[PDB]
Amino acid sequence: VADLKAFSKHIYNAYLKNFNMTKKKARSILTAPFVIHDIETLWQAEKVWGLPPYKEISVHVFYRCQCTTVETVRELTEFAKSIPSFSSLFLNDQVTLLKYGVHEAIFAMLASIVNKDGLLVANGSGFVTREFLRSLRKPFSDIIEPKFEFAVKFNALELDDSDLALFIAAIILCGDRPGLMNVPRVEAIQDTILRALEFHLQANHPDAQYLFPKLLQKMADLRQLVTEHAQMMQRIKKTETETSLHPLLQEIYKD
Ligand SMILES: O=C(O)CCCCCOc1ccccc1CN(C(=O)c1ccc(-c2ccco2)cc1)C1CCCC1
Ligand SMILES: CCCCCCCO[C@@H]1O[C@H](CO)[C@@H](O)[C@H](O)[C@H]1O
Numbered sequence: 001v002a003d004l005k006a007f008s009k010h011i012y013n014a015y016l017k018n019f020n021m022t023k024k025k026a027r028s029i030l031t032a033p034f035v036i037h038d039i040e041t042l043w044q045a046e047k048v049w050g051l052p053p054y055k056e057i058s059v060h061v062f063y064r065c066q067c068t069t070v071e072t073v074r075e076l077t078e079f080a081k082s083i084p085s086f087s088s089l090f091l092n093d094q095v096t097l098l099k100y101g102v103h104e105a106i107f108a109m110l111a112s113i114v115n116k117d118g119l120l121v122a123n124g125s126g127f128v129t130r131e132f133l134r135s136l137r138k139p140f141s142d143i144i145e146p147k148f149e150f151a152v153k154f155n156a157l158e159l160d161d162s163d164l165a166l167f168i169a170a171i172i173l174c175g176d177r178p179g180l181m182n183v184p185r186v187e188a189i190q191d192t193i194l195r196a197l198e199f200h201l202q203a204n205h206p207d208a209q210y211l212f213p214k215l216l217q218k219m220a221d222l223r224q225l226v227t228e229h230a231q232m233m234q235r236i237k238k239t240e241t242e243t244s245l246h247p248l249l250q251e252i253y254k255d
Pocket of ligand 2 (some may be wrong): 073098248254255
């Protein structure tokens with residue numbers, strides 16, 4: 001309880017140092033950004049704002065998701081490396097962790113910039129509506145909406161940034177990942193983060209009953225969210241041959 005408090009402080013600093021936007025700053029903005037809600041406003045935003053050559057509205061928007069997804073893998077990688085227990089693993093295990101962990105963490109973190117009406121883009125200087133993203137053609141509308149369903153429920157838990165750092169540290173440092181070399185070591189670290197999380201919630205959310213087991217179920221739900229995301233990504237790679245898929249995301253899905 002004493003030790004695990006110090007542990008959590010370090011993981012929080014890892015978080016504050018590496019992530020380009022806190023949930024704190026996102027809610028404050030979300031409560032002014034340029035609203036993108038149709039083709040004209042997307043154009044004006046671009047003309048708020050170097051991607052692959054143009055194809056069409058839905059694909060262009062998918063290119064922008066893809067670029068932000070890659071940018072977030074970057075942050076998550078620096079954040080992981082800022083955790084001494086992560087950085088102490090052999091480099092191959094770090095890659096295995098990030099490979100199977102980042103999309104779960106990405107979708108967890110995504111909730112911070114989402115409300116029921118849309119999400120922030122371009123570092124908070126823009127806001128893209130959910131109805132606009134719903135209007136894109138299949139399969140680009142289908143891959144977007146489920147993340148929204150997840151976020152609004154997740155945001156009802158009202159985690160702050162110090163909760164999120166442990167929660168995401170817990171997602172990354174997961175002994176379950178296929179092809180781990182040193183499983184007992186990663187399981188041990190995961191257990192520690194989870195114990196630290198449990199205590200942290202006790203102090204930070206003293207009136208929130210069931211919050212810890214609530215968040216453990218969200219980790220199980222994120223796992224299913226990502227399975228469905230990869231399946232949709234398989235369909236896009238198969239039916240949308242003219243859409244470019246970033247090589248880094250390719251190396252992640254190839255598993
Ligand atoms: O999986 C992969 O690796 C392949 C990529 C598919 C990812 C599916 O993308 C989704 C789905 C749901 C919610 C958000 C996003 C994309 N994101 C955005 O922040 C974002 C960025 C730009 C726009 C935009 C600009 C102009 C008009 O719209 C809109 C949203 C999040 C997601 C996680 C990191 C970023
Ligand atoms: C930047 C952090 C995220 C990295 C995620 C990408 C991991 O890709 C994997 O890299 C391995 C070599 O390291 C290959 O042996 C695997 O075939 C490949 O799937």
